[PDB]
Symmetry: C4
C-alpha cells in the first residue's frame, strides 16, 4: 500500500486520452484495470502500483500481464482481482483457492471488505436493485482501504456511447472470450464516509460535472509512444485450461 | 456495544403500549425486533441501538429497514440476525456467507455464543425438549454479551391470546411470507449466572409477576405519533430473490 | 484445567471396586468416563473434574449427564468427547458443529492434539496396525495436555474377562444402542515423553504389574452408598433424534 | 528449523555417489527425499534434519520411515509432504486432514508458501507451461523458508539417462505403486530473490556447470556401508488402506 501518498485511478474510458497533464500531481502511484495495455501511448507511464482484473478473465489477464512484464512494457507491484464474494458474480472455487493459484496477487475483496459501510452500500444496491459500481469505483474503494487520501480520477466516462474506450477493443482474442448516477453516488458516499478527497484530471469528461478538477500544480510529465506493443489479450494452452477447469 | 449503559429490550407484545413511562430510565439504548415498525406510535423513540430479525425473514427485513432509514422513520446502529447455528433452524449457506451479503449487519450468534453456559442452556432445552426462548430473551443474552448490566424489559407477554401484538399484524405482504416458563427460567438463569439486573417497565404484564418493576426515576419522555408510516414488510424484486436463492 | 494438581483417572474395569484407599492422595481432581454412573457406590466421590464420552453415544450421554446433574447424583466441571478427528471413527458433521450443539462441552481432541508426538503415536498404531488405546489412556493424554503431572490410575484392567466391569452393564437402554500391551506401551510413551508420573491405586490389578503403586499417604476418604440411582443411559425423544440426525 | 545453520540438500541422482567429501562443511543438517534409503552406503550419514515425500506415496513412505527409524537405519526430526495445494496434483482431502493422520509431520507447502514470489514463480510455470521443479528444488525453497542461508546441493543431475539414480530402483513393491533449465532457473530465482548462497558438492555433475563448487574446507567425514538394509518401500495392510481410502 501507500498511505499518505497520492494515487491516480484510471478507467479506460475515452477521457484517458484527454488528461489535463498540468493538473497531474508531481508524484503518484497508478492504478490500472482490465484492457489498460491496449492504450496506444503511456498516458500514465509504464509503472503501475496496482492492476485490477475481473474474476471472469483473471486466468487470461494474469497470463497476459506476465508477458507484458517479461517484455518490459509495464511493471506493477500489486495484482488485484476485483471480486465481491458473491455467488452470482464469481466462481466460488476460484475465490477459495485464489492465493494458491496466484500467490503474488490479491483478492481485491480482502481490502474492499475493510470498508464495511461501503461494502454494505455496494451489496444493497447490487443485490436488491441490480445497480453495480464499475471497476473505476471499485479501485477507489481499494485505494482508500490501502491508506490513500488523495485520489485523482481519469478514464471514467460512464459509457457515453460516443466513444466506448480510449482505444480500439476490436481484438480477436478478447472478442472470443452500470450507470452515471450509480458510480457518482458511490464516489460521493466514499468521499463523505471516509473523509478522503477526489479530484478529476479530465475537464472534458462528464465526471468533471460532479467532482472538482485537480489543482494546476503543473508537472513536466512525458507521454511516451508505444511501438509493436501487446494490444490483445493472450490465450493460455488447452493444457493450462484443463488444470484451471475446476475454477471455471 | 455499550457496557455500563442501560438498555430497553422491547418485545412486540401488547404490553409495549402499556409502558409505565415514569419508570423509564433517564438515558438508554433501545433494542427492537421483527415487526417493531408496525407500531402506531414511537413508544420507545425513533432511535434504536439495535434491531433483530429472524433468519427466515432477514432478506426482506433488511430491505425494509433500509427503506425505514431512508424515509427517516427509524435509525439504528446495529442490525442483528437472531441465529443459533442450528441446521434445523437456519439455512447453512445463509449463515456462512452472511457478512458478505449484509456487511453492516451481525450474526447475533457471534455475541450469543460468548455466553457459553446460556448457549448450552438454550441448546439443551431446544434440542432435547423442543423448548425455545423467544426473541425477547435472545436479545437479553446479546445485550449481556455486549456489556450491558441493567436491562429493562417491555413488550414481553408470553402470547396471552387476549391480544397477540401491540399492533395490527394483518398485513398483506407479511401474511404472504415457546412458553411463559421457558422464557422466565431463561431470564432467571441469565440474571443469576452473569450477575446482571432485569427490570420490568410494564406493571400490567405477566412479566411483572416474576421480575421486579423498574424504579420510579420518572423521566420526561415524549411519545410521538406516526403518520403515513410503513406498516407492512416490503417484498424485494424477483431478480433480487434470484440472487439470494442459494441462501433460500 | 488444573496444572500442578493431582488427578485420578478412572476406567470402569472391576478394579474400580478394589481401590486401595490408603494410597489415595489427600487432594485430587477426578476424571470419569462412559458408564461410570452405573457404579453402585461413589468409589471416587460425586464430584468430577471431567467426564468423557465416545462420539457414538455422546448425544445420549450428554442428555443423561444433565439428568444426573439435575438429580444431584454427580457434578462435573468439564464434559469431553473422546474424538480423534478420524473419518472411520467419527461422524464428520458431528465434530464440525460440536461446539454449537454442546456449548459447555469440549472436543477431547482439541487437547489431545497438543501432544503432537502422542497423537502421532496413536494415529500410527491405529491406522496401520489396528491397535487402539482405550478411554483410560485417552484421558491420561488429555490430563497431561491440561497441565497435570501426577496421574493416579484405577479401573484399568485391560478386559480380563473374569469380570468385564465394576458393575452390571446388562441395562435395557444401553443394550439397545484393544489390548494390555497397546495401553501399557502408550502409557510408557506418555510418561517418558512428557515427563509426568503415573501411579496405580489398585494393587490387585494387572496394571500393578507394570506401573508402581501410589505411596501410602493414607487419607480419610469416605465411600458413600447410592440409592435409587440412575443405572441405565437415557434415550432422547424421536423429535430430538430428528434434530440431531445430520450428525448421525 | 535451523536459521544460520548449513544444510545439505540431497537429490537421489547418480551424483549422490560422487560427492567431493573434501568440500563438505564441518557441520550441517541433511535434507533427504523419496527413495533415499535405497542408497547402498550412508553417503550423508544416518541423521536427517528432514525427509520429503510426494503426496502420491506419502501413506506408504510414512509407514516405511517408521520402520527405518524403529530399525535404527535412519533418524529424522522433520517429515515433510512436498505438496503445492493444487487440485490436479494432490488429493484435496489428503491435504485438508493431513495433520490429523500424520501429527508429527508437516505439509511442505506451509513453509513453501512463505516465499510468495517463488510460489508465484512455480505456479505460473507449472500451470501455464507444464514446467515443474523437481523435489531437489522444492527442498531448497523449504530450506530457505526455514531460515537456512547456505545450501549445499548434491544428487541433482536433471535425469541424464546415463544413470537414473544412485542406486537400483528396480524394487518389487515400489514398481507396484521436468528439465535442466526449469530447475536451474528456479534455483537462480531463489538465490537472487532471497539472497542465499547455493553450493555444489559434486564437481562431475551437470549442476557444477551452473553453480559454483563449495570451498575445500575439508572435513573428516566417514562413509559407512549398509548391511541387510531396507531397500524397498513397505506396503501397508488392506485394513490400513481401507481407513485411508477417502484420501486416495
Ligand atoms: N466509456 C467508458 C468506458 C470505461 N469506463 C470505466 O472504465 C472501466 C473500464 O474497464 P471496463 O469497461 O473493461 O470495465 C470501467 O470499470 C469504468 O470505471 C467509463 O467510465 N466510461
Ligand atoms: N403476545 C406476545 C407477543 C410478542 N412477545 C415477545 O415479543 C417478541 C415478538 O416478535 P415475534 O412474535 O415476531 O417473535 C417475541 O419474540 C417475544 O419475546 C410476547 O412475549 N408476547
Ligand atoms: N475390564 C475392563 C473394563 C474397562 N477398562 C478400561 O475402562 C474403560 C471403560 O469404559 P469402556 O469399556 O466403556 O470403554 C476403557 O476405556 C478402559 O480404559 C479396562 O481396562 N478393563
Ligand atoms: N538422474 C536424476 C535423478 C534424480 N534427481 C533429482 O533427485 C530427486 C529424486 O527423487 P525422484 O526422482 O524420486 O523425484 C528429483 O526430485 C530431483 O531433484 C536428478 O536431478 N537427477
Amino acid at each position: 500500500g501507500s498511505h499518505m501518498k497520492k494515487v491516480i485511478i484510471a478507467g479506460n474510458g475515452p477521457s484517458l486520452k484527454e488528461i489535463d497533464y498540468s493538473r497531474l500531481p508531481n508524484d503518484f502511484d497508478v492504478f490500472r484495470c482490465n484492457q489498460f495495455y491496449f492504450e496506444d501511448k503511456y498516458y500514465l507511464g509504464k509503472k503501475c502500483k496496482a492492476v485490477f482484473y475481473n474474476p471472469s478473465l483473471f486466468f487470461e489477464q494474469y497470463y497476459t500481464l506476465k508477458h507484458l512484464i517479461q517484455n518490459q512494457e509495464y511493471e506493477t507491484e500489486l495484482i488485484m482481482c476485483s471480486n465481491y464474494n458473491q455467488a452470482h458474480l464469481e466462481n466460488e472455487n476460484f475465490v477459495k483457492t485464489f492465493y494458491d493459484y496466484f500467490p503474488d496477487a490479491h483478492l481485491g475483496y480482502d481490502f474492499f471488505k475493510q470498508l464495511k459501510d461501503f461494502n454494505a452500500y455496494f451489496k444493497f444496491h447490487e443485490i436488491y436493485f441490480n445497480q453495480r459500481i464499475t471497476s473505476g469505483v471499485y479501485m477507489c474503494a481499494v485505494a482508500i482501504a490501502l491508506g490513500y487520501k488523495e485520489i485523482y480520477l481519469s478514464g471514467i466516462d460512464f459509457y457515453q456511447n460516443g466513444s466506448s474506450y480510449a482505444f480500439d477493443t476490436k481484438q480477436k482474442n478478447l472478442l472470443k472470450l452500470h450507470s452515471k448516477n450509480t458510480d457518482i453516488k458511490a464516489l460521493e458516499f466514499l468521499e463523505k464516509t471516509y473523509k478522503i478527497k477526489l479530484y478529476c484530471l479530465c475537464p472534458n469528461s462528464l465526471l468533471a460535472n460532479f467532482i472538482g478538477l485537480a489543482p494546476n500544480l503543473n508537472s513536466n510529465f512525458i507521454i511516451q509512444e508505444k511501438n509493436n506493443y501487446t494490444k490483445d489479450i493472450l490465450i493460455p494452452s488447452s493444457e493450462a485450461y484443463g488444470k484451471f477447469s475446476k475454477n471455471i
